[PDB]
């Protein structure tokens, strides 16, 4: 008895094949008699409609580009006291002795983060990195520091 009252007051039969629009439009080759209705809708909606940008594609250049090719060369200048502070900080971070809290690979890491943060590594940074990696027996990492110095 509680199901005999709740009829189909919510749904409707689906669109047949080659059906027309409720406004009278139809998908023909000639769309002169058909019209758009984007200008009758309200201009701004609080939220997102179910048909809002449902089929929206982007350019092929976004999916054919290589890595790190969008980064432009920016000359980030700073104060010379900031230069001294950051150079001393990176030189102390490179020269950390490898205990149980530091692996020697960090001596190669803090050089690389020096170049990602757009600093020019001085010769003392390369000297300290090669001496720290030679003191731990990592000779290929020291040659990689030399290759980093040559590629700069």
């Amino acid at each position: 008895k509680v199901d005999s009252f709740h009829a189909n007051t919510q749904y409707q039969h689906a669109w047949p094949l080659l059906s027309h629009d409720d406004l009278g439009n139809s998908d023909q080759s000639n769309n002169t008699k058909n019209i758009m209705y984007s200008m009758y809708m309200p201009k701004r909606n609080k939220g997102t409609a179910p048909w809002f940008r449902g089929a929206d594609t982007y350019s092929v250049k976004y999916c054919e580009q290589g890595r790190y090719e969008y980064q432009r060369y920016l000359m980030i200048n700073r104060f010379p006291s900031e230069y001294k502070k950051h150079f001393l900080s990176f030189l102390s971070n490179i020269r950390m002795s490898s205990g149980s809290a530091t692996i020697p690979q960090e001596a190669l890491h803090w050089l690389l983060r020096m170049i990602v943060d757009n600093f020019n590594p001085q010769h003392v940074h390369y000297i300290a990195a090669m001496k720290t990696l030679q003191s731990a027996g990592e000779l290929d990492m020291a040659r990689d520091v030399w290759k980093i110095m040559e590629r700069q």
């Binding site: 027309h20 406004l23 009278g24 209705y37 009758y40 309200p42």
Partner: peptide
């Protein structure tokens, strides 16, 4: 007010809906 926003597309003369309205208001 009483009119909807689709009123000018619905009652535009020459349209399918306007011809249907004129045909049902005068058979």
């Amino acid at each position: 007010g009483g009119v909807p926003r689709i009123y000018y597309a619905w009652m535009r003369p020459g349209s399918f809906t306007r011809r249907r309205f004129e045909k049902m208001r005068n058979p």
